[PDB]
Design a protein around this nucleic acid. Structure first.
Ligand SMILES: [Mg+2]
Ligand SMILES: [Mg+2]
Ligand SMILES: [Mg+2]
Ligand SMILES: [Mg+2]
Ligand SMILES: [Mg+2]
Ligand SMILES: [Mg+2]
Ligand SMILES: [Mg+2]
Ligand SMILES: [Mg+2]
Lengths: 131, 48, 178, 221, 99, 192, 49, 143
RNA sequence: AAAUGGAUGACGCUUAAGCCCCAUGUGCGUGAUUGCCCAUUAUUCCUUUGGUGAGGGCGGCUAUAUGGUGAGAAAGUGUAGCCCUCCCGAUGUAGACGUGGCGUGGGGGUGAGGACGAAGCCGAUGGCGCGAGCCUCGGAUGGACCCGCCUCUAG
């Protein structure tokens, strides 16, 4: 199945927004925190400091949530969940949950190849096998 | 930039949805919103 | 072509009213960069001499005066300038030039260099083309005699902009860099 | 800068004999110090290799006493706590020129340090640069184009001699020998120069006439 | 004075020294030649095996003259030229030709 | 309209020649229309000057409008002189502004002029049905000057291409602000 | 833009044709000569008065 | 009057005409001189063949943006150049019919060159190569 | 005429690189009306977000199997926004308000997962979101429980 691949995908920023001075303290996490300090150089927008996220960095609505392969990810948990993606198989791809066992995965992978439903973490060799 | 001396103090407060949780209120709002847009009736716009 | 301060003639009057019908018409000579400045100087002089302001007056004409042909002449310029320390100073200077506008432009640059007087503190009273044998300045009358000749020394020659170089060989004209 | 054994073996294996990079040799006689340094500094930043000679003949505007006093005021500045860390006051003309050029460079970056390493300065014309080719001048920094004839100027060699330079007599003796040696050789090798000029004049009589007409039209012969 | 912008570069060409001269070179292709430290893929890697080498090139184009003295502005396709090239050689070719 | 412009110009030239031939003078009519542009920013503006600029619709630097130069309007312009530059426009200047930068104010929206039909719809008057009607009403004083000019969004222009002399200081002293008479046309040609 | 100019003003074609005729060489030399004669004749007649 | 769909339609600069002498700016034959023969049917590349015994350039296609067209022109009315066709390049150690075509074209081209009054100088001119010496300024030349 | 050695920012500059004034592309007394450089400014173009926002479509009959082209279309504040055009704003301490905005322990419902390996832990495992965060991969880790969605509750 071939998706409707966008002509070009533009990201306004690839780097992440990290916390101020998170590299100098092992206990500080990298997740973003808004700085509220009366003298903070980041909050005051000095030239050589880190940037703060805001609404202008938003992604284009036409290519939002689209993976590089051109699909959108939808989780699945059993065989019966594959028929939800059967008709719109050019738009959504299935993602098998991490906690699904190997015994149940064999049935899901076998049916998905039969139905022509793309799985992001299925069998690598089967999808290359032509029909 | 622009002046914007008195721009903000001229905005009104307008609501476009109901706070009510009554489903029958929502059905009436749906009917008269349609009639207000598709008819030349000041009465219908007032009801909505 | 070269000089700034073109030669202007401005003609104006006061707006007629029922106290003063048919007012007098005045004619004014001024040296200005453009006609907007020329009209500004006209209304200043009309106000300080006739009590007529630009609000109650009209401008009839404002054109550029044509000068004579190109030749070497003696020009006498009587000029005045103001300073806080001394007040008003009045002098008569002489220059060699080819046109009235050029001589007046020379005087303005000369006053700025020798007395530090700006354009708006200077008033021109007149400019005249005077003959020889009537010049009282030796630095001007030295250009009068026939058979006058002199050499050019301490020249600072420069190549045309298309052929300038940075490094050149010592015993030839061959360029090395640029 | 002296090659090691490793360089000698590698050159011998690959059969390399000699190599000379592209270098411009500038004769700094009767040049204005400040204007020559500014032009040299920019060319170094553009990636040129420059060697200057006769640094003792650079000129500075003003009387010698005025410039001597200027240097003595510079000599007074030193770190009081430990003068061996303080500013260093070099006394030779070539060291003075290098300091002047260094002040017109970004000397605290690797780019600036690399540019300074590309400049070599000498007093007089040393024996290793005499036969390297024709020397050049900078017309925008020459004395006869920069100073009015009535002003008084200072020769850098005479100024440095009275503030600590000790090799003024040595340089003068070496220069006298070079002029004698070069003058003798240039008086020689005149028969070959005359012979070459005569051969060109003998041509235009044996060469084809059509090509002679072309040369005349373009003003070459 | 505030800093530099690395999306545009300035190139000085020999024997130009004039804005009217620099206008002749607008639109010409340029390249910066350097070398790496191991052989990687190149154009005609299979057709012409003699081309394989450590040599690499980064290409760009001349956009407009800069100043009044023959300096030109160059943009290197979609990225910047590395700062290790400051003060090094740049090749200016004669194509595309308008003559 | 083209015939009217040619006839008016050549009639005026004949009158001037008649006076010059006989030694008299001909006095011109005072200008009726001015074109005003803002050349300063929005920082540190006193309340009196702030109000006047709002009434002239010059809320942003390099905005431009057309006004009628009568006594009430002249006294307003004198109060905000160090913030504006103005002069007397020509026919070419008016045509360039309408055709290249003309926008209409329709239903509160700023729409660009693309054809005569939207001009006809916006002005329900019968004397304003095309772009040339807009130009004639502005160049000449016209009966519907206020209707036509108020229906146009204020013009948003680019900075002068060749630069400026001095933002401070009057044009007479060598600066940029104040009245420039017909020399405003050279200023606006680089700006448009 | 040519098609936008004509759309906004359908008289553009004739206005430009007048300008081209103004620029024509033979007509502009005749106009220059005729203007000189007309001005000179009026100057002489006014003086003779 | 020529329509864009018609084969005869082309948009190439007026200096590039049949019989013009050009300098190759890029490729394995950089710096050598050649003669422009014709243009391909559509708005395609030109076909150049400097007399192969003179400059060493065989029949080839080249883009108009990689040659400098000089003002020297040799009359080409005699040479038909009708056999030149896109199919000879379309086909993918030279071949026999390619050699025969090259020989026929070269023979006609050489005769046309010798017909010019400066035939001998033209033959020497085609032998010369173009290079950029230290201190040259191609932007100041006239060509 | 002052207390460490030091400052037109430094070097330096005197046919100035000093002081006062005047000019400008190619061609400065024959080219009238732009010598050149540098912004979070102005013009123009693309994208996001919020509107006192402005318009339009929404009663699905043209015709068509696989091995002329294939997918959607909800009468709608708020989304993975029902969809398509257009216009105007966007910084901000103290402070106010909004969010089908994120995350944690437990209750009522609904739907799944697990010895073919749950929770927990490790990471040059990548992908998605402006972000709080979410998900996949690997473990030459572990050995028994746990989660998605709608609502209720809080140490
Ligand atoms: Mg991201
Ligand atoms: Mg504070
Ligand atoms: Mg300025
Ligand atoms: Mg400074
Ligand atoms: Mg905010
Ligand atoms: Mg706060
Ligand atoms: Mg608890
Ligand atoms: Mg607590």
């Amino acid at each position: 199945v071939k998706p409707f691949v966008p002509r070009n995908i533009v990201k306004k920023r690839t780097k992440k927004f990290t916390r101020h001075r998170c590299e100098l303290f092992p206990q500080l996490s990298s997740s973003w925190r808004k700085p509220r300090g009366e003298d903070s150089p980041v909050r005051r927008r000095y030239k050589g400091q880190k940037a703060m996220p805001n609404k202008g960095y938003g992604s284009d609505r036409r290519t939002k949530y689209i993976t590089p392969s051109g699909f959108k990810n939808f989780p699945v948990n059993n065989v019966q969940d594959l028929y939800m993606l059967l008709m719109q198989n050019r738009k959504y791809a299935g993602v098998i949950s991490h906690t699904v066992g190997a015994k149940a995965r064999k049935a899901i992978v076998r049916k998905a190849h039969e139905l022509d439903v793309r799985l992001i973490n299925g069998n690598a060799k089967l999808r290359r096998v032509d029909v | 930039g622009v002046d914007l001396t008195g721009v903000q103090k001229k905005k009104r407060v307008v609501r476009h949805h109901t706070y009510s949780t009554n489903p029958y209120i929502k059905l009436l709002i749906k009917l008269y919103k349609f009639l207000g847009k598709r008819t030349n009736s000041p009465f219908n716009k007032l009801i909505h | 072509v070269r000089p700034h301060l073109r030669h202007y003639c401005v003609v104006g009057r006061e707006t007629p009213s029922e106290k003063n019908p048919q007012p007098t018409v005045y004619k004014f000579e001024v040296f200005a960069p453009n006609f907007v400045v020329a009209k500004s100087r006209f209304w200043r002089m009309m106000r300080e001499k006739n009590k007529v302001k630009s609000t109650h007056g009209d401008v009839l004409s404002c054109k550029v005066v044509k000068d004579r042909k190109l030749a070497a002449r003696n020009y006498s310029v009587d000029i005045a300038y103001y300073s806080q320390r001394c007040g008003y100073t009045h002098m008569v200077k002489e220059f060699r030039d080819v046109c009235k506008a050029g001589a007046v432009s020379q005087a303005y640059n000369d006053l700025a260099s020798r007395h530090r007087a700006r354009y708006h503190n200077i008033e021109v009273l007149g400019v005249k083309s005077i003959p020889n044998h009537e010049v009282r300045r030796l630095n001007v009358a030295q250009f009068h005699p026939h058979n006058l000749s002199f050499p050019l020394l301490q020249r600072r020659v420069k190549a045309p902009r298309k052929d300038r170089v940075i490094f050149v060989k010592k015993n030839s004209k061959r360029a090395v860099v640029a | 800068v002296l090659p090691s054994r490793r360089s000698l073996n590698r050159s011998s294996r690959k059969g390399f004999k000699k190599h000379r990079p592209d270098i411009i040799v500038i004769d700094l006689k009767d040049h204005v110090l400040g204007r020559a340094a500014a032009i040299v500094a920019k060319q170094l930043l553009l990636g040129k290799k420059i060697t200057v000679v006769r640094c003792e003949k650079l000129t500075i505007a003003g009387s010698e006493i005025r410039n001597k006093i200027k240097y003595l005021q510079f000599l007074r500045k030193r770190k009081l706590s430990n003068p061996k860390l303080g500013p260093f006051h070099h006394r030779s003309p070539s060291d003075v020129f290098i300091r002047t050029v260094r002040s017109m460079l970004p000397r605290y970056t690797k780019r600036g340090q690399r540019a300074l390493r590309q400049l070599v300065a000498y007093e007089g014309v040393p024996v290793n640069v005499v036969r390297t080719g024709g020397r050049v001048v900078i017309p925008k920094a020459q004395r006869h184009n920069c100073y009015r004839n009535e002003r008084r100027f200072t020769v850098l060699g005479n100024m440095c001699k009275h503030v600590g330079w000790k090799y003024s007599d040595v340089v003068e003796k070496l220069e006298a020998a070079r002029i004698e040696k070069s003058g003798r050789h240039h008086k020689k090798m005149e028969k070959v120069r005359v012979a070459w000029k005569n051969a060109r004049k003998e041509a235009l009589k044996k060469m084809p006439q059509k090509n002679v007409e072309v040369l005349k039209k373009f003003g070459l012969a | 004075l505030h800093g530099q912008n690395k999306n545009t570069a300035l190139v000085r060409i020999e024997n130009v020294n004039t804005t009217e001269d620099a206008k002749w070179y607008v639109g010409k292709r340029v390249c910066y030649v350097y070398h790496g430290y191991k052989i990687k893929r190149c154009v005609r890697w299979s057709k012409a095996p003699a081309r394989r080498s450590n040599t690499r090139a980064i290409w760009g184009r001349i956009t407009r003259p800069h100043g009044t003295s023959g300096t030109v502005r160059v943009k290197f396709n979609g990225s910047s030229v590395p700062a290790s090239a400051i003060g090094r050689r740049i090749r200016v070719y004669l194509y595309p030709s308008r003559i | 309209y083209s015939r009217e412009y040619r006839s008016t110009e050549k009639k005026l030239a004949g009158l001037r020649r008649n006076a010059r031939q006989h030694g008299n003078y001909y006095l011109e009519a005072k200008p009726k229309v001015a074109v005003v542009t803002r050349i300063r920013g929005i920082a540190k503006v006193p309340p009196k000057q702030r109000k006047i600029l709002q009434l002239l619709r010059l809320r942003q630097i390099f905005n431009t409008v057309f006004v009628r130069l009568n006594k009430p309007m002249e006294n307003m312009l004198r109060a905000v002189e160090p913030y504006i530059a103005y002069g007397y426009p020509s026919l070419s200047t008016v045509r360039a502004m309408v055709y290249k930068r003309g926008h209409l104010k329709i239903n509160g929206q700023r729409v660009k002029i693309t054809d005569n039909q939207m001009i006809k719809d916006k002005y329900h008057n019968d004397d304003i049905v095309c772009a040339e009607d807009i130009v004639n009403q502005i160049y000449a004083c016209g009966k519907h000057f206020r209707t036509v000019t108020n229906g146009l969004w204020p013009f948003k222009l680019a900075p002068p291409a060749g630069g400026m002399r001095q933002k401070r200081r009057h044009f007479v002293e060598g600066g940029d602000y104040g009245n420039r008479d017909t020399l405003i046309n050279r200023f606006l040609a680089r700006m448009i | 833009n040519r098609r936008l100019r004509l759309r906004l003003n359908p008289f553009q074609k004739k206005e430009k044709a007048m300008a081209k005729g103004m620029q024509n060489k033979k007509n502009r030399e005749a106009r220059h000569a005729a203007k000189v004669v007309r001005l000179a004749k009026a100057r002489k007649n006014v003086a003779k008065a | 009057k020529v329509s864009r769909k018609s084969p005869e339609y082309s948009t190439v600069r007026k200096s590039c005409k049949p019989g013009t002498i050009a300098i190759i700016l890029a490729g394995r034959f950089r710096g050598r001189r050649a003669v422009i023969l014709k243009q391909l049917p559509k708005n395609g590349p030109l076909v150049i063949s400097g007399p192969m015994k003179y400059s060493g350039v065989p029949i080839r296609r080249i883009d108009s943006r990689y040659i400098i067209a000089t003002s020297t022109r040799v009359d080409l009315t005699g040479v038909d150049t009708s056999a030149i066709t896109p199919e000879i390049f379309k086909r993918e150690t030279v071949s026999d019919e390619r050699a025969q075509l090259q020989n026929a074209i070269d023979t006609a081209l050489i005769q046309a060159i010798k017909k010019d009054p400066l035939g001998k100088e033209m033959a020497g001119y085609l032998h010369s190569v173009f290079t950029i010496k230290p201190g040259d300024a191609p932007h100041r030349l006239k060509w």
